[PDB]
Design a binder for these strands. Structure first.
Ligand code: ATP
Ligand code: MG
Ligand code: ZN
Length: 689
RNA sequence: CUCUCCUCGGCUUG
RNA sequence: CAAGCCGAGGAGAG
């Protein structure tokens, strides 16, 4: 209900009706400022008998929910009507009625965007920006290129230009709401010189139509005393050992290569080799040549294994391979569980090649002689920190992959010194279904976060999920285990580490170029500060001139870009689908039907006798609903689906080859919307009757 | 510009 | 809780 001086100085120009940005360090009370400004605004508008409505825009669901239940509601509920929305609520069915019924709204941006689109073209009630008096935008550094924020603000700018034109013509001009942007750092984008940094800052200030940036400039000592920085630290590891396991893997890779007469220029264990193998597999699949597709797939797996070993334990790589080969065997035998049998020689060669050295690999992976230097350094760091504390320490470890989070959690649990010192660890990952690994659910995220808040969990092992938008208590140790993304993320993760006598550690090796990337980000930071300091002291007139120029340019460039998006012949029966591996006719483009313009199915009797059903592994670890579909050759095709009480198969296009009847330059597409032909809706007149 | 990794949102069938 | 659809951003390699 009250503010501190360094908050009030940045707040004032907004209390006067100017639209601005506010950059403040992580954890220094931006949300408080937002609430206070909201209250003052509403009161001040109520004095003069005017309409006052405030809308708050976020980009995450959890963030809306949390800010409503915890910050905005318990301070203004006593005077005003508050509501919060998202896609997880049912309140979204009538957004206008919500608009008129409540004063303060909290929401994700795409809701508003959809309503605006409805008004623009649809037949629905629709909403317009004029209906609001104040718009707050959290994490305003996302207002760029094609983000949803920027579409909204483009509408705003177009209205402003239209008002400028009306000013000399008929009056009055349409009124527009005040804008308030909050952030921690606007960043530098892709900048290589100071001038480009200035340019970027001005672009951000233009997209939001801001009067100033308004950073803290006076009470630096108080702020520094309140929020104190950690001590930055590097840790480097060097090795010239760990030979046997890696050498055996390399030998197997070479043996596989000499069986198909394919040697690339790139070396083993890099992204270049992975790219080469993917290209090779794609081409073989297109041509229909087996014995090259499969070898390429297996080579990709082995390269992944090497990459894994480079970062974590050997046994993780061993398991990566074991799982794959076990599954392949199970698929082949579930196939052969049916009724003379003809095998494939190359598949057998690969299977035997793995199973002949399995035991030797398992034996080599278990050897404390050569574990990993990075893991050793990490253990030392953790133990030092947690022993020095006397049970008063929390910590975060930022990793790159999901599998690495799981693996580090297991590695920590298998050793007893950690448990001795008071270490309780848990993993945290994202929720999207495109990452080789089954995601975590929002509910589980919430639970993990809560238990970290209370104290049941001491340290987290996370991907970039935890950089922004999560309510996390102050930590004593932040560690980056071979990860460097950008300057904004660096600022955020470093601001995690409050709780005085804290440190910020980066662990890595000597060969990679991670250290240099960190150093370059450190340079970019001071570039940014200098540019901001200049833009603050620019003369108002030229400032406005540049801002206007940039806005016009933005609108015009978007116009030109949209001109071309206007632009696919429909010939369903024309194409046929072939299996990648066992190239053979599977179906024609006339039997494929579409449910609700989303789900691609095939309901024909002769297709039911072409595939096999497996069980659901996600549910395996009861019942089985969406079981996987495989061909006889062992290639996956899709899954099972239920509609109107009927069981149906759903197909994934990335598993097939498309063959036309005109010229037959075969192709792959990776998703349905790229295939230029159309399909018909479902009809019960067919398939029976 | 391509490929991979990572994150987010809106929406359907059960 | 499972499956599917569409869009957006960031990093790296080539
Ligand atoms: N005026 C104030 N009076 C009392 N406490 C305050 C005030 N301002 C900030 N705080 C303290 O700061 C915390 C809230 O900070 P807040 O999380 O809003 O910072 P932030 O800028 O939102 O950081 P983040 O980037 O995590 O959102 C509260 O726990 C509260 O105790
Ligand atoms: Mg905040
Ligand atoms: Zn097949």
């Amino acid at each position: 209900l009250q503010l501190r001086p360094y908050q009030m100085e940045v707040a004032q120009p907004a209390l006067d009706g100017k639209n601005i940005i506010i950059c403040l360090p992580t954890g220094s009370g931006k949300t408080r400022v937002a609430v206070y400004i909201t209250k003052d605004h509403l009161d001040k508008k109520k004095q003069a008998s005017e309409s006052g409505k405030v809308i708050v825009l976020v980009n995450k669901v959890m963030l809306a929910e949390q800010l409503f239940r915890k910050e905005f509601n318990p301070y203004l509920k006593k005077w005003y009507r508050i509501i919060g929305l998202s896609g997880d609520t049912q309140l979204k069915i009538s957004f206008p009625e919500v608009v008129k019924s409540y004063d303060v709204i909290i929401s994700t941006a795409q809701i508003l965007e959809n309503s605006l689109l409805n008004l623009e073209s649809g037949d629905d009630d629709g909403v317009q920006l004029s209906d609001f008096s104040l718009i707050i935008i959290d994490e305003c550094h996302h207002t760029n290129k094609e983000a949803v924020y920027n579409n909204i603000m483009r509408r705003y700018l177009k209205q402003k230009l239209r008002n400028n034109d009306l000013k000399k013509q008929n009056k009055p001009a349409i009124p527009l709401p005040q804008i308030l942007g909050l952030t921690a750092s606007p960043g530098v984008g892709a900048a290589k010189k100071q001038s480009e940094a200035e340019k970027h800052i001005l672009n951000i200030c233009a997209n939001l139509d801001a009067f100033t940036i308004k950073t803290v400039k006076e009470n630096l000592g108080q702020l520094k005393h309140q929020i104190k920085e950690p001590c930055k630290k590097f840790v480097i590891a060097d090795d010239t050992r760990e030979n046997p396991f890696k050498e055996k893997l390399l030998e197997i890779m070479a043996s596989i290569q000499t069986y198909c007469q394919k040697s690339p220029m790139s070396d083993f264990g890099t992204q270049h080799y992975e790219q080469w193998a993917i290209q090779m597999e794609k081409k073989a699949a297109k041509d229909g040549n087996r014995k090259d597709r499969v070898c390429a797939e297996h080579l990709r797996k082995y390269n992944e294994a090497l990459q894994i070993n480079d970062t974590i334990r050997m046994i993780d790589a061993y398991s990566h391979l074991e799982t794959f080969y076990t599954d392949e065997k199970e698929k082949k035998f579930a196939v052969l569980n049916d009724s003379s049998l003809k095998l494939d020689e190359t598949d057998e060669f690969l299977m035997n090649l793995f199973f002949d050295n399995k035991k030797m690999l398992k034996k080599l992976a278990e050897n404390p002689k050569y574990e990993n230097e990075k893991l050793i350094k990490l253990r030392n760091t953790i133990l030092e920190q947690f022993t020095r504390s006397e049970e008063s320490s929390r910590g975060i470890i930022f990793t790159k992959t999901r599998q690495s989070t799981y693996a580090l959690s297991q590695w920590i649990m298998e050793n007893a010194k950690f448990a001795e010192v008071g270490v309780k660890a848990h993993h945290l990952i994202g929720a999207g279904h495109s990452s080789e690994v089954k995601p975590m659910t929002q509910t589980e995220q919430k639970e993990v976060i809560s238990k970290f808040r209370t104290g049941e969990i001491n340290l987290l092992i996370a991907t970039t999920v935890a950089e922004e938008g999560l309510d996390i208590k102050e930590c004593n140790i932040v560690i980056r285990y071979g990860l460097v993304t950008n300057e904004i993320a660096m600022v955020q993760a470093r601001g995690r580490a409050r709780a005085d006598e804290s440190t910020y550690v980066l662990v890595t090796s000597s060969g990679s170029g991670v250290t240099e990337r960190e150093i370059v980000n450190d340079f970019r930071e001071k570039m940014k500060y200098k540019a901001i300091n200049r833009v603050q002291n620019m003369k108002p007139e030229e400032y406005a001139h540049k801002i206007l120029e940039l806005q016009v340019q933005s609108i015009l460039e978007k116009k030109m870009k949209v001109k071309r998006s206007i632009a696919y012949n429909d010939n369903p029966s024309l194409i046929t689908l072939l299996c990648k591996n066992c190239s053979m006719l599977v179906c024609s483009g006339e039997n494929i039907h579409v449910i609700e313009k989303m789900h691609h199915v095939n309901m024909t009797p002769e297709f039911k006798g072409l595939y096999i059903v497996r069980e659901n592994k996600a549910l395996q670890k009861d019942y089985q609903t969406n079981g996987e579909i495989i061909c006889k050759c062992g290639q996956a095709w899709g899954t099972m689906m239920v509609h109107k009480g009927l069981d149906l198969p759903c197909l994934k296009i990335r598993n097939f080859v498309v063959n036309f009847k005109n010229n037959s330059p075969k192709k792959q597409y990776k998703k349905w919307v790229e295939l230029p032909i159309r399909f018909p809706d479902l009809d019960y007149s067919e398939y029976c009757l």
